[PDB]
Amino acid sequence: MELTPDQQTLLHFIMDSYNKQRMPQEITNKILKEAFSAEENFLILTEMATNHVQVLVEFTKKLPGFQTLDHEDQIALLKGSAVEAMFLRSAEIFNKKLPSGHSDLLEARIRNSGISDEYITPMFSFYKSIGELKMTQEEYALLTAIVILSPDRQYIKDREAVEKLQEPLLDVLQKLCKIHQPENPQHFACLLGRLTELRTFNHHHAEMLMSWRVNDHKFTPLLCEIWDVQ
């Protein structure tokens, strides 16, 4: 049941690499302190997402065996997972415990941030459903690595090479799930099930961004090639 020394080494390596991200406190404190216009909030998201993509590329290239992959499959994996990794990270941040009434204010601030009503509902249903999993930082880190190293992404030339890389991470996560939550033996299945919901956000993402109640939808050149926006 317990982790092998290789798995323990793998877990800690993924964990350190994952912690190079912007602190959940830095994001929440920024939007909780002041109420912003849709224009300022669009600009906050665009800055947040550019930093996120940058740190995501660095996290991804530290994933074991990632640098041994074909360079075209490398791009495909990063483009394929970037939106999902972003919503999983927002879901992580959203569900961090804050003082009384703070999580309620954060939610109300995202709700009136500037996004269309139609996208708020599936986004908050996904966040609340991730919270019901009571995920550890380790679980968030591994699931992000699993999302990145998805062999069933579009335009992947060598699925098997990606499969061989994702399999040790799935093994670790499963060992963790059966350790922390023996009470819920279906916890691992529930985690993998959320991944199929993340995929839906990817499909309607460009529409989500253009639907923001701003006059100009200006993105950074990096977000432009990652999100396929103009």
Binding site: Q54, V57, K61, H71, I75, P221
Partner: peptide
């Protein structure tokens, strides 16, 4: 094409 992502990956 995606030269920014390519640049970040190849550094």
């Amino acid at each position: 094409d995606h030269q920014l992502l390519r640049y970040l990956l190849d550094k």
